[PDB]
From a paper:
The 1H15N-TROSY spectrum revealed that both conformer A and conformer B were populated with a similar ratio (60% conformer A and 40% conformer B) to βPGMWT recorded in standard NMR buffer. Titration of lactose into βPGMWT had no effect on the 1H15N-TROSY spectrum, whereas titration of citrate led to equivalent chemical shift changes and sharpening of line-broadened peaks to those observed in milk. Citrate is coordinated in the active site by residues T16, H20, V47–R49 and A115–K117 and mimics substrate binding to some extent. Both monomers share a similar fold and overlay closely with a previously reported substrate-free βPGMWT structure (PDB 2WHE29; non-H atom RMSDs of 0.56 Å and 0.95 Å).
βPGM-deficient [name] is unable to grow or has impaired growth, when the sole carbon source is trehalose or maltose, respectively. βPGM is a monomeric magnesium-dependent phosphoryl transfer enzyme of the haloacid dehalogenase (HAD) superfamily.
Numbering used by the authors: 1 to 219
The structure:
Amino acid sequence: MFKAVLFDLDGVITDTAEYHFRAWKALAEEIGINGVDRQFNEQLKGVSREDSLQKILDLADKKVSAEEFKELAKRKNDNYVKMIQDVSPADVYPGILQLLKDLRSNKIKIALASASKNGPFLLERMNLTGYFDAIADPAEVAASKPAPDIFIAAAHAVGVAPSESIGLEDSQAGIQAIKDSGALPIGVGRPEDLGDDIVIVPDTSHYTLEFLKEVWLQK
Ligand SMILES: [Mg+2]
């Protein structure tokens, strides 16, 4: 049987995407650039703060100083950090709390493998800290998803090999990272997005200890 479950945060435990979008739209409004809508925002997911700001500046072909660029990026993040002050246990996705309770009682390690620089803060605010045996520090990983580094780090931090672990993710990049770590991915979402070759559930209410055990045995 598997020995650990490696969780991403956004799209698995809770939603951070909505707050990122609001922080970028607020910032875009302040400097008078139109076109930062949820459709545009798809081009911001999975990219660096700097690269996302550059994409928003390209909308208006706006140039800034290196100093102003750094300030705008910082403002966006300060805005983001203010908005996530609202996060509570009410924002934990369906099934996730009960899953973490069952894993813990069954002595299965729990690690976060998130690029969130606020993962620890966000787990405290949702009252989940007590379930996690490790959080992989994204500032200490050389390469982002779809590179496996952060899933490897999360597994090593709880004393297992990725080969002994299940990884939970909703993103193409995330599923590819889990697969290349040697962990077994279980996707949440749509086969059209995440591939036909892995087990996928429509939503997190299906991520149960019993379902995870069935998947591991079946391959
Ligand atoms: Mg995700």
